[PDB]
Design a protein around this ligand. Sequence first.
Ligand SMILES: NC1=N[C@]23CC[C@H](NC(=O)c4cccc(Cl)c4)C[C@]2(COC3)CS1
Length: 390
Amino acid sequence: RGSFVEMVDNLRGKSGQGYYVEMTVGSPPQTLNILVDTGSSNFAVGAAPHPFLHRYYQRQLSSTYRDLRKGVYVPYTQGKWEGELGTDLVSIPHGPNVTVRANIAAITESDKFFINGSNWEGILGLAYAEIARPDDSLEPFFDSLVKQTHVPNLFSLQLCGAGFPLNQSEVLASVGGSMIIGGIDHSLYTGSLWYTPIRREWYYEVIIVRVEINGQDLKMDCKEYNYDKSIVDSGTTNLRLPKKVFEAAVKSIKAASSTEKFPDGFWLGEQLVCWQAGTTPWNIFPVISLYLMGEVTNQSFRITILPQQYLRPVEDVATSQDDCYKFAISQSSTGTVMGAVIMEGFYVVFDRARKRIGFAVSACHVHDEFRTAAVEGPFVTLDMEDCGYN
Ligand SMILES: NC1=N[C@]23CC[C@H](NC(=O)c4cccc(Cl)c4)C[C@]2(COC3)CS1
């Protein structure tokens, strides 16, 4: 049974632009669409006009606005946002029937943060205080929610990729998945949930202990897979891999798919590839299995993803009925990132109460008649703590 009907189907969006949930801030409530981001820890919202914002938080119109008189500045490689800290009353309409007082970073300045046509106006950083800006004293939203209400200390995400391009109108009309706040809805997955420990509460950090490409062991020292960390991050599009792991994986994926040659720009994640309508040769691309540390000593399990996850549907550069995709695995210098395209294969349970992440096959994962995504175990795996980087 699915016991959280109120929250089922409360997300919209897609891997390329982000998945978002409706929220309200202030009194009277101001509605905003908010990116669900398990890879950061600030609740931050557009609070001033911007060419790509249809709306923003107007603090002067909220009677419950409190000014913390403190700035916050978040630079990343792509750009930056700067804002002003305060608190206000916050609700999630398609969420628990509660209102909480939470920290809000009112974004007043930004560079390449807001995206034309994303339909979101802010970000909900769902990770832990250690990585909150400006410092760990700024309580994240979910911590406030748990402290102030009886909502259990757990949330779960089903991100639903369509398997094909969605135009502006279609993405607004389409269900993009579910964020279940405070529980696990059994309608959103098939088979069993398998849990991996949260290694440390900052990012949602996990430990990968083995990688296979079509059953073939990538055969790297498992420390390489988690160098310098491995995280689950709904606010990143791609599966990102440490440089050396990326190089090994791409070599192996190229070898498995070698009946067709793709240009270097494709493997660099820059250039799309297209096939005649309906003829995408899924079967020539390999499955990718990531083995994760289990909860039991010396036990692991695996999650298996299809090319229908790691090839991201995109519309053609020019007018055609071709089916086109970008390669959604890319290189990282900050560790492995299990981004939205991986998360689309699975129902992911962020069990903060029990310091563990659950994976099950998603009821909305894209597949074909011959292969499905999988979550399978157990496997006997020795010395898994050695796979963690220090
Ligand atoms: N986890 C992350 N959080 C941040 C906030 C979210 C931001 N992501 C996006 O704009 C975005 C765009 C398209 C698709 C998707 Cl899925 C996400 C990237 C960063 C920037 O700052 C924190 C870094 S990485």
